[PDB]
């Protein structure tokens, strides 16, 4: 199954991607929980 | 040719509207299907929506094993009201 | 030692002789620890890396969207608070669930081979699936009813080797198939062909060749075959006459060619068995080349491809034998090298060398097509395309489920080095299966065992719930993958991206529609414990009942300390349903472990290690009852050991481990049997099951002869309330107990008050009574862990499942013929075995298409005698005695088109009753059941109209909450008056007034919480209960019935002696002694020699001494004896016979007199299972209470007055009342309702059907001459419309001959055969 | 048929019949439109599998499966598949005038009668009461007579007592293995809810009092009432249908009172006195001036049936005990006195009932087997026999055999470490050694258990038979055998293994002294092996007796 390591290598690629964005020009949005769009 | 009890073509056309409108409302945002909140989206009275949803026959089968063990049937446990003791 | 508050009231005489190093741990640790790992409530920002709820989100969420530039990233999840509490959830029908809000962000990309220009949008998503959030006792409140989820004992993933020799091979030596069992799906197999070959297979495929699987993976056929059996190279200087002498292969092989090597001497004659002396000559000789013949190399095939340097091409392919025509080519080509295979019959046969020529699959290109022939022959995939296709099909991680424990068991069995193997198969593991499967044929090693505890894994609720949550997540991603790819992030929100329906539906069916989640039987605190320690081998994805056989339903030498061998249910599943041991504990991988004591040759160490099943065969394990020299040394030359799963006897210099306690082998229910070593294993198995079916009596009575584990079952079951913190009890009420927390055990800076609400008479899952009674007083101090109020069937913290009766063993006029019990009238007048049963009766109001159903107070065709018990709403009052046939609630249904018979309307005009168009469908009690209405619950829709009684019950609930809040503030108000006054009188005016603002700030902040709590309960009372669609109102009542003991009820003991009471004789008829004390129960002594259970009599002998000592204490206490004489007699009982106790620690005037008052009825004694009292210690207490050491006295007959001519064994035995009463066993029927198609009797009208007349009873009548009795029971008693109605008229008329007619089972058979186009008629 | 809440429920044949009509009418309309052969050949093909799926399912035509797990239930599936209407009725059928309840021993009942509760008799015999109330004049209509039974009027009990006087009822246990599983009894009204069963018919029914239930049945027609009295009565089937031996014999509780009564003692109270008749023996015993078993001489008047048609009486003076003379009072006239001069074991009583059946007949035997049950229950209560902790006597020479056999194995284990014997040679040496010591303890235990009772006759130490409770229950054949007393007093021996081998270390302890933790775990191997074997004994033997009936039924 996809239990543990089936998609582990993909997480490191996405984690490193957000690190470059959060360094310069990185913003975080506090979206409300109950939002339709 | 779908249901057991045949519905006329004049009441079966408007029945698909209540079933199509109920599908979009249940998936709005973590919503549960119910006949109370659908009466406002279609501007239908409370007594009218209970008759349209209840018009669906959805007949069951008596030759089905009730429970995990396949040793008893539903037809073998039914009784009659016309014949007496 | 120091005694707590509960232990000072009554002390049990312990006959234990072995010291205890470790006490019994928490019994329900397997249900609580497995759920905390899955549901991590208390955690920091950094979660754990377990396989629970966090691993599911960490494996399904982080996936990019195909044909798009979006991806979902999982950040974390948080657990909220439940809407309702624990106790207020079983009455409303809620699931006591808790929501979880997982924070998942959505990322966007540009699909430019680089993750740039992203926009993270973190949004706390709504609850996906509400977790049931099991309680602190290990139960899941699902839809109001608490359930347990038993653990599953499934097979561990890995490889398994065995013999499997049967009728298929028609011989003794046979080769088994190594069937690799993954975690889920993608099964494999490897079967060895009988003709020195190997034929692998699949879960559904036929026999596949093993030669094509070697060259398709990338390995060469020449190198893989040379490294399988052996490899030998020979040099040839123009003539191929040489043999590489192997010191290992030449040993044990005869040489048919005479050799003259040795510079003038002979080594081996013509066809002679070489000896070890001549074999060792070749080592010190140093020779390697020898003159070999040409006719002896024709059998030895070649290993690798031989290439000649003169010709330039492969002169001989791999796996080719030598022939006569192939010998002249070597002399002409003059090859410098030669490689042949040296195989023999004494060693392992080269099965891989012979199977390499099968189907002509040796090359790399020809082997890749043979595999595709078995997977998909003639498919759309090409020859080379299917090779790359199949290479990635079974290599998929999601397809080939291989857990971490399965990878460990895979490498450990084959002998690999890397224990934590990867989830995918490796090329280094495929070579170990070949060398291990062919080795099991010649018998050069050992095989595996599929029934050992090392191959079986325990799966708890934490893994079964995480697997269902994982399936629910993969069902969400498959539906939200197409929605995210065809859309963007700026047009929607992360909430609308995925759906939460499949997750909530996956966990809804696991707790409500799974065979593992079953209703907990709470008719006994012991049944609740054994239901949670239960390990079932059945269930989904496991071994079922039909495929069990006999090899799994037995015990194994590895079950010592992990699974109880005398706790299997007798019936269709015996040996499949097991129970965990007392000291057993699961390992990290899921294997069962048991504690042991490391013992050395000089000192038994104090450290305790928990050993698994596979780690047990290395060490030497001795018994726990081994003799010691008061210094840690064994004093026996011959000790009992089980080092290699063999119960043998060895020396004390070879022991390495020691057991902790003799009770670690038996389970909890099996350890509560005193003198277990004297009972047979068949009776002990039945005694532990009947002890589980005991009904809580009206008065709880402790057993005079116990074990000591009774104070651990009642504490770990949770039926009794224990003190969370220590302090002084403030006030004791019959419904609640409030304690004042001590000054030292307070976490915050206030006083602190704990309030415990006691559970009053409530209904159990088995329709029994459950209530708690206070045990503390006003003004006594308690510590953390003391029992404040005992639960059902508990006596002062102990376990009281039954009562101890005066038993005499003798035949009494045949009333105790085989197993019947001759009872007295004293046990009925004293209300000994009387029990309370609570029954629930519900009445629902639906919405008929003609008209709705409403609860009213007007019933047609009734009188005043039936409406006086109801009220203005239509429901009976609480506390009204209802007989059989009374009306509970009023309910009428509108009817239309009745079509009344004209002969009926003439009769209604006789009296003058008006015609009402309403059918009477009121809720009434069944026939034969009477009780008292103790509680009425009313449920209605949210916003629906409520009757007058709905608000009346609401007003009572709103006041009991208000009375509790006023009591909470009243006790804390007095603490503010004594603390402020003590500091004002004792020892600056500004500092005195400054502390008043802080004291009043706490009483004002608590007052604000009381208003929030009061408005919370008021809001919950107004919330309408959600029910099934189509129901308007639900009214349920509760009836309480007190069932006494009557002839027919089933009684039993703790030693497997069950019976049914036959008669209740008066007191004057029971046998009495010289003093005139009559017995209570007369048992038959003929059962003891048949079923060997001597502990049944040893309990009777020890029970006589326990009651005899209580009579001396009572006589000593009534004569106003001094305290110095009481503690002297108590020291003679506890500190003189055996075991070990301690006195002179309690006050004589207050705590010793209170102890002697609890021993007035009898002195309780503790007898462990294998560390109990002997025959000498039992007779030592018989002579202490002025009783005969033989345990037998001469009795007198109550009816004739004559004395019996033989001494009779008397004493007190603990009896139990089982849940097999005759009130639900006696049935009778004359007529009734019949079915629709087949006119056969059936139930459904508050009455059962009939007795099924099977074929075995037909053969009994056919064996007789009863032809009219057989025809009557087949035609006129069933399946006859004109037969039953005309026979009933005959019985009333007076005469009765027969009415045969024709059965309806045959009339329907004719109409069904005719509908198949087959004509069938009666020729007559 | 509809259900609760307006929901309907149909069968699996309505949608099958509807599917054929939907395709048959579609084919009839496709023929008048002059449709080509390309489109009409596919519609005629659909009509094939439409009717084929209606007749039977599982063939090459896959059955329809819509919104359901099970495939379907066609016409042929109603008469086949282990659930057909023809096979479901052959294995069972509910009947009227029946009921069930637990069983209970009644020691005061006769052989031809049983106990029936009042609450069950009112329901089983309900139609017979309605016809008796109208014939007597207590009720005018059947509607008024039914209301009298619901109120339980006192005059209804007088009517119920008359409708069951000569009306037999049938009792049967759930496992009906042989013919004696169904027997007819005359029901009597008892207070309670449990069916009072006769103690002697418990052997044929194979029924114990552990909560077992027994079904009842009421024969309606007088043709079935005569078959229950002349064929299915309990007094008619007194012999087994498989052998010639009586099946209704005194059980363990009755044979225990008849063995203690006829058990000669050496010296007792009232030994050597003479009695003029059997009535003086009872008169001397009831006064307490004579022991139950003392050597006396009583003059007896007996009759001999050995002569053809001549019942000649003979008066002789015999030398017997007091208990054997009291037992001869219930013996019929056709039997001599030499039949009660023995110790009256279980094998001796069954041979007396068989000999009594061939001499005096059946009427004098059904009243003689009831007298043995009354005499056995009476004299087993006077003697308060009981099992205690001192009844399992241990031979003093058991320690001299266990300690000697343990030293004979220590000298062999030294030879195993020296290379003299092999693994297989040592296995057969220690297995045959403990088997010899187990038989040596058993023969030394029975010698000390049977001849331990000593007495004094005018000054002496004479050894007689042991009057021990554990010895009497095994000697009389009531309960227990040599293999069970061996495990209580003597050593248990060597235990088996589910694999089929014998463990080297035996169980040298008994159940009186107690077992160790390892000795108790070894005994659990053969315990669950025998318990799990019973599940196959009821599944394999039941399949054998069913195949034997299907062949020899005609
Ligand atoms: Mg039984």
Numbering used by the authors:
A (entry chain G): 54 to 90
B (entry chain F): 166 to 250
C (entry chain C): 1 to 987, 1020 to 1356
D (entry chain D): 253 to 806
Original authors' sentences:
Pseudomonas aeruginosa (Pae) SutA adapts bacteria to hypoxia and nutrition-limited environment during chronic infection by increasing transcription activity of an RNA polymerase (RNAP) holoenzyme comprising the stress-responsive σ factor σS (RNAP-σS). To understand the molecular mechanism of SutA activation, here we determined cryo-EM structures of RNAP-σS holoenzyme at 4.1 Å, SutA-bound RNAP-σS holoenzyme at 3.1 Å (SutA-RNAP-σS, open lobe) and 3.9 Å (SutA-RNAP-σS, closed lobe), and SutA-bound RNAP-σS promoter open complex (SutA-σS-RPo) at 5.8 Å. The structures reveal that SutA pinches RNAP-β protrusion with its RNAP-binding domain and wedges RNAP-β lobe open to facilitate promoter unwinding with its wedge loop and N-terminal D/E-rich region. SutA anchors RNAP-β protrusion through its RBD and wedges open β lobe through its wedge loop to facilitate RPo formation.
Focused 3D classification reveals one major population of SutA-bound RNAP-σS single particles, from which a cryo-EM map was reconstructed at a resolution of 3.1 Å, and one minor population of SutA-bound RNAP-σS single particles, from which a cryo-EM map was reconstructed at a resolution of 3.9 Å. In the structure of SutA-RNAP-σS (open lobe), the RNAP-β protrusion is embraced by a patch of crescent-shaped map that could be assigned to SutA-RBD, consistent with our YTH results and cross-linking data in a previous study. The 3.1 Å cryo-EM map exhibits clear feature of an α-helix in the middle of the crescent-shaped map that fits well to the 20-residue predicted helical region (residues 57–76). One end of the crescent (residues 77-90) travels across the surface of the RNAP-β protrusion and approaches σ3.1, four residues (81–84) of which likely form a 4-strand β sheet with RNAP-β protrusion. The other end of the crescent (residues 54-57; wedge loop) fits into the narrow gap between RNAP-β protrusion and β lobe and leads the rest part of SutA-NTD to the main cleft, where it likely adopts an assemble of multiple conformations and thereby does not show distinct map signals. SutA-RBD occupies a hydrophobic groove on RNAP-β protrusion. Several hydrophobic residues of SutA (L67, M71, F74, L75, V81, and I84) likely participate in the interaction. In the SutA-RNAP-σS (open lobe) structure, the RNAP-β lobe domain swings ~10° away from RNAP-β’ clamp resulting in ~5 Å increase in distance between RNAP-β’ clamp and RNAP-β lobe compared with that of RNAP-σS holoenzyme. The gate loop (RNAP-β residues 373-383; corresponding to RNAP-β residues 368-378 in E. coli), which serves as a rate-limiting gate for promoter loading in E. coli and M. tuberculosis RNAP, is opened along with the movement of β lobe. The main cleft of SutA-RNAP-σS (open lobe) can accommodate the downstream dsDNA as shown by structural modelling.
